[PDB]
C-alpha cells in the first residue's frame, strides 16, 4: 500500500514560509538584541539582520513535497 | 517455506526518502535552532544544514530490498 | 533417531541477513536519533551508522546450519 | 538388570551442539538487543556476542554419554 | 452472516472530531503549561500549540467508516 | 468427511480489515497518547501513527481463506 | 445515538477565559519574577508580560463548542 | 452548572496591590543591591527604584475579576 | 409482568448528588494532598480542585430514572 | 426510603475548618521547610505561607451539607 | 457527636513557639553558615539572621486553637 | 501532657557559646585566609576577624531556653 | 441478660498505656532509625520522636471502659 | 488479672543505653562517612558526631519502666 | 536475664583504632587527592591530613565498653 | 576472637612508599604542568616539585602497622 | 522420661563452625560482589568482608549444647 | 555421626584462587572501564587495578578447610 | 573431582591481547577525541595515546592460566 | 576453539586510514576554525593543521591485525 503519515498538507501550511513561524522568529532578536545596551553597550549583535531570510530558504526548499 | 514478515512493501514506502519522514525531520532544527537567540545568541547551531541529506543517504541505501 | 526441531529451513529464511529483519533494524535509529535535536542538539548519536552491518555479521555467521 | 531411561540416543541428537538448539539461542539476542536503541541508545548489551559459545561448551561436555 | 460489533454509530459520535474529545485534549496542555513558570521559566513548551489539530487529523481520517 | 469449524464466514467478517476492529484500535492511542503531556511532556509516543496499518496487513493477509 | 461525554457545559465555564483559570496564571509569574532579583539580578524574565493573553487566545478559540 | 475554583475572593486579597506582596518585594532590593559596594562599588543597581510600581500595575490590572 | 429490581427509590437517594457520597469524596483529596508537601513538596496535585464536580455530573445524569 | 450514610454530622466536625485537621497541616511545612537550609539554602520553599488558607476554603465550601 | 482528633493539647505544647522546635531551628544555620567560609568565603549567607522569628510567627498564629 | 523533645539540656551544652563549636569555626578562616596570598595577593579577606563574635551573639541569644 | 465478653479487665491491663505495649513501640524506631545512615545518610527519619506519645493518647482515651 | 507481656526485664537490658545497641550504631557512621572522600571529598557528613547521644536520650528516657 | 548481642568482644577488635579500619581510611585520600592535579591543579585538598586522627577519636572513645 | 580484615600484608605492599603508587603520582605533574606553556606561559605551576615527598610522609607514617 | 529429639549430635556437626556451612557462606559474596562492577562500578559492597565471622559467632555460641 | 555436606573437595577446586573464577573477574573491568571514555572521558575508574588480588585474598583465606 | 568452568581455552582466545578486544578499544578514542575540537578546541584529551598499551598489560598478565 | 568477534575485516575497512573517517575529521576544523574570527580574531587556532596526520598514524598502526 501507500503511506499514511501525510495526505493532508497540514504540517506544510503550519511550519513553512507562508505561515506564522516566520513572524515569531523575527521578533525574538529585537526582544534581546535591542535591550542589551545596558551592560555591554557595544556594536556586536548586528550580524543577525540578514541571516533570517537565508536560514529559512536553505531549509524549507530542501524537499518541497 | 519462505518468510512472512514482508511481502507487502508497506514500511518501505512509509519510512523512506520519497515519503513523509524527510519532512518531519527538516523542520525540527528551525523550531529550536532559530529561536535560541534569546539565551545564547552565538554562531553555534549552524552545522546542521548539510547533515540532513547525508544521514538519510547512509541509512536508507544500506539494504535496499 | 534424529532430531525433530528442524528439517524445514523456515526460521533461517525469516530471521537472517537475506530476510526482513535487516530492514526493521535500520530505520529505528533515524526514527529517534534524527529527531532528538529538539532537546539535546549535540553530535553524539553518530556511532550507529557502522555497527549495524557488524553486529549482523558476528551473529548470523556463527553456526550457519 | 540395566537401565531403561536411555538406549535410544534421542535427546542427545535434539538438545546438543550439532542440533537445532544452537540456532534458536543465537537469534534471541539480535531480536531485542539490536532494537532497544529506541529508548536507551547506549553501549550496554554488547557483552553477549561471546558468551554464547562459552555457555554451550561448559554444559554439553560435562558428561558426554 | 455480517458483523455484530458495529451497526450503531455510537463510538464514532463519541470519539471523533465533532464530539467532546477535542475539548478535553485542548485544556490539558495549558493546565500545566501556563503554570510551570515557577521552577522552569523557559521557552521550551511552545511547540505544542500546533500539533493538536495535526495529530487528530492523522488518526480520525484513517478509516472513516 | 470434511471440517465443521468453518463454513459460515462469520469470524472473517468480524475480525478483519473491512470490519469494526480497525476502528477500535485507532482511538486507543489518542485516548492516552494525546493526554500524557501532563507528567511526561516529551516526544516519545509519536511512532504509533504509522504502525497501525502495517501490523494489520502482516496479520490479516497471512492465510486469507 | 448521540454522545454522552458532554451536554452539561460544565468544563467550559470552569476552564476558560471567563472563569478562574486566567487569574491563577497571572500571579504565578510575579510570585517568582519579582523576587529573583537577589540571585541573578538581570534583565531576562521580562518578556512574559505579554504572552499571557496570547497563549490563552491560541488555545481557547480552537474549537469553541 | 457554574465554576467552583473561585467564589471566595481569598487569593485576590492575598496576592494583590492592597495586600502584603507589595511589602516583601520592596525590601529584597535593598538587602543585596545596597550592600554590593564591597566588591563592585559602582553605579549599576539603580534602575530598580522605579520598575517596582510599574511591574505590579501591568500584571494585577490584567483581568481584575 | 414488570421488573422487581426497583420501585423503592432507595439507591437513588443514597448514591446521588443530594446525598452523602459527595461529602466523602471531597475530603479525601485534602487528607492526602495537604500532607504530601513533606517528601515531595512540588506543585503537582493541584488539578483535582475542579474535576470533582465534573465527574459527579457526567455519571449521575446519564440515565436519570 | 431516605439515606443511611449520614444523619450524624460526625465526619463534618472531624474533617473541617473548625476541627483538628487545620492544625496538623500547618506544622508539616515548618517541620521540613525550615530545616532544609543545610543542603539547599535557597529562597524556594516560601510560596506555601498563603496557599494553606486558600486550599482549605476551595474544598470545604463545595457542598456544605 | 464532636471530634476525637484533639482534646488533649499535646501537639500544641510540642510543636509551638514555647516548646523545643524553636531551639532546633535556631542553631541549624550556624552549623552550615559559620563553616562555609572555607570554600566560598563571600558575603552571601547573611540574610538568615532575621527570617527565623518571622517564619515562626506567620505559621503558628494562623489558627491558634 | 507536656513536651518530650527536650528535658535533657544536651543540645544546648553541645551547640552553644561555652562549647566546642566556637573553636571549629575560628580556625577555618585562617586555614584558607592566610594561604590565599598565592593567586590573589590582595587585601580582601580581612573583614572576617570581627564578624565571628557578632554572628555567634545574634543567633545564640535568640531564645535562650 | 448482660454481656460475657468482658468483666475481667484483662485486655485493658495488657494493651494500654500503663502496660508493656508502650515499651515495644518506642525501641522499634531507633532500631532502624539509627542504622539507616549507611546507604541514605540524610535528615529524614526525625519526625517520629514526638508522634509516639500523640498516637497512643488519641487511641487509648477513645472509650475508656 | 495482670499483664503477661513483661515481668522479665529482658528487652530492657538488650535494647537500652547500658547494652550493646549503643556500640553497633556508633561505628556505622565512620564505616561510610570516613570513606566517602574518594568521590565527593567535601565537608558534608560532619553533623553526626553529636546527634548520636541525643537521639538515644530522647527515646530511651520516654517511659523508663 | 542478661543481653545476648555481645559477650564475644569481636566487633570491638575489628572496627576500632588498633585494627585494620585505620589503614583503609588513610590510603583513600592519597588515592584521589594526590592525582587530582590534572584538571584542578590548585591548593584545595590539603586540610584532610589532620582530620583523620580527630574523627577517629571522637567516635571510638564515645562508649568504650 | 581476633580481626579478619587483615592478616595478609597485601594492601600495605601495594599502596605504600616502596610500591608502585609513588611512580604514578610523579608523572601526572609533568604530563600537564610542563605542557601548559601554550595558553598561560607563566611561572605558576612550579611549587609542586617538593610537596610530593611531603604528602607521602604525612600519610604513610601515620599508623605503620 | 527424657527427650528423644537429640542424643545423636548429628545436626551440631553439620550446621556449625567446624563444618561445611562456613565454606558455602564465604564464597557467595565474591560470586556477586566481584561481578557487580559492570553496571554499578562503585565502592559500596565492601562492608561484608568482616561481618562473616561476627554473625557466625553471635549465633553458634548462643546455646552450645 | 559426621557431616555429609563435604568430603569431596569439589567446590574448593571450582570456586578458589587456583581455579577459573579468578579469570572471569579480571576481564570484567576492562570490558566496562576501557569503554567509558566515550561519554565521560575522565580519570575515575582507575582504582580497580589493585583491589582484584586483595579482595580474593581476604575471602579465600578465611577458613581454608 | 576437578573443576568444570574451564578446560576449553575459549574465553582466553576471545578476551585477550592476541584477539579482537584490542582493536575495538583503540578506535574508540579517535572516534570521540579527534572530533571534540568543535565546542572545546583545547589540548586536553591527549593523554590517552599511551595508557592503552599499559592498561591492557596490567590486567591480562595477572593470572595467565 | 578460536575467537568469534572478528573473522570478517569489516571494522578495519570502516574505521581506518583508507576509509571515510579521515574525511569527516578534516572538515570539522575548517567549519569552526575559519569562522571564529568574529569574537576572537586572533592567531591562536593554527596548531591543528599538522596534528591530523600525526594522531591518525599513532593510533591506527598500534595493532595492525
Ligand atoms: C565590531 C566587532 O563586533 P563583534 O565581532 O561582534 O565583537 C568582537 C569582539 O567581541 C569585540 O569586542
Ligand atoms: C545571560 C543571558 O542574558 P539574556 O538577556 O537571556 O541573553 C543576552 C545574551 O545572551 C548575553 O549573554
Ligand atoms: C564556531 C561554531 O560554533 P561552536 O563550534 O559551537 O563554537 C564553540 C563555542 O561554543 C563558541 O563559544
Ligand atoms: C530554547 C530551546 O531549548 P531546548 O533546546 O528545547 O532545551 C534546551 C535544554 O533542555 C536546556 O538547556
Ligand atoms: C563527541 C561524540 O559524542 P559523545 O561521545 O556522545 O559525547 C559525549 C558528551 O556528551 C559530549 O558532549
Ligand atoms: C559496554 C558496557 O556496558 P554496560 O556496563 O552494560 O553499560 C555501561 C554502564 O552501565 C552505563 O550505563
Ligand atoms: C526525544 C527522544 O525520545 P525517545 O527516543 O522516544 O525516548 C528516549 C528517552 O526516553 C527520552 O527521555
Ligand atoms: C546574596 C546571596 O548570594 P547571591 O544571591 O549569589 O549574591 C549575588 C552575587 O553573588 C553577588 O556577587
Ligand atoms: C554604569 C551603568 O550601570 P550598568 O549599565 O549596570 O553597567 C554598565 C557596565 O557594565 C559598566 O560596568
Ligand atoms: C507542573 C504541574 O505538575 P505536573 O504536571 O505533575 O509536573 C510534571 C512533573 O512531574 C514536574 O515535576
Ligand atoms: C527562586 C524562586 O524559587 P523557585 O521558584 O522555587 O525556584 C525557581 C528556580 O528553580 C530557581 O532555582
Ligand atoms: C578593600 C577590601 O577588600 P574588597 O572589599 O574585597 O575589595 C574589592 C576588590 O576586590 C578590590 O580589589
Ligand atoms: C529535611 C527534609 O526531610 P524529608 O522531608 O524527610 O525528605 C525530603 C527529601 O526526600 C530529602 O531527600
Ligand atoms: C558542614 C556543612 O555540611 P553540608 O551543609 O552538608 O555541606 C555544605 C553544602 O552542602 C556544600 O554542598
Ligand atoms: C584555596 C583554598 O582552598 P579551598 O578553600 O578548597 O578553595 C577555595 C576556592 O575554591 C578557591 O578557588
Ligand atoms: C608568582 C608565582 O606564581 P602564582 O603565585 O601562581 O601567580 C599568581 C598570578 O597568576 C601571577 O601571575
Ligand atoms: C562506601 C559506602 O557504600 P554504601 O553506603 O553501600 O553506598 C553509599 C551510597 O549508596 C553511594 O551511592
Ligand atoms: C580524582 C578524580 O576525580 P574523582 O574523585 O575520581 O571523581 C570526582 C567526580 O565524581 C568527577 O567529577
Ligand atoms: C593543558 C592541560 O589540560 P588538562 O590537564 O586536560 O585540563 C586541565 C585544565 O582544565 C585545562 O583546561
Ligand atoms: C600566538 C599564541 O597563540 P596561543 O598559544 O594559541 O594563545 C596564547 C595566548 O592566549 C594568546 O592569546
Author numbering:
A (entry chain 5J), B (entry chain 5K), C (entry chain 5L), D (entry chain 5M), E (entry chain 4L), F (entry chain 4M), ...: 6 to 70
From the paper:
The infection cycle consists of the following steps: first, the ssRNA phage adsorbs to the side of a retractile pilus via its maturation protein (Mat), presented as a single copy in the virion shell. The capsid of MS2 is composed of a single copy of Mat and 178 coat proteins (89 coat protein dimers) with a T = 3 quasi-icosahedral symmetry. The F-pilus, the receptor for MS2, is a dynamic filament assembled by the F plasmid-encoded type IV secretion system (T4SS), which directs the conjugative transfer of F plasmids. A recent high-resolution cryo-EM structure revealed that the conjugative F-pilus is an assembly of a stoichiometric pilin-phospholipid complex forming a five-start helical filament.
To improve the resolution of the F-pilus, we created a loose mask around the F-pilus and the Mat to locally align the density within this mask. This allowed us to achieve a more uniformly resolved density of the F-pilus/Mat complex at an overall resolution of 6.2 Å. The ɑ-helices in each pilin monomer are clearly resolved, as is the internally buried phospholipid, which interacts with the ɑ2–ɑ3 loop of each F-pilin. We observe that the exposed surface of the β-sheet-rich region (or β-region) in the Mat lies parallel to the axis of the F-pilus and directly interacts with the N- and C-termini of the pilin subunits within the F-pilus in a defined manner, in which the tip of the β-region leans opposite to the N- and C-termini of the F-pilins. The area of the interface between the β-region of the Mat and the pilus is ~1062.89 Å2. At the pilus–Mat interface, residues of opposite charges have electrostatic interactions. The positively charged His357 from the Mat interacts with the Asp7 from one pilin. Two arginine residues, Arg36 and Arg99 from the Mat interact with two aspartic acids, Asp7 and Asp23, from the pilins, respectively. In contrast, in the phage-bound structure, we see extra cryo-EM density extending from the N terminus of one pilin subunit into a hydrophobic pocket (consisting of Val15, Phe31, Leu33, Phe92, and Phe94) on the exposed surface of the Mat. This electron density may correspond to the five N-terminal amino acids of a pilin subunit, which were previously missing due to their flexibility but are now stabilized by the Mat.
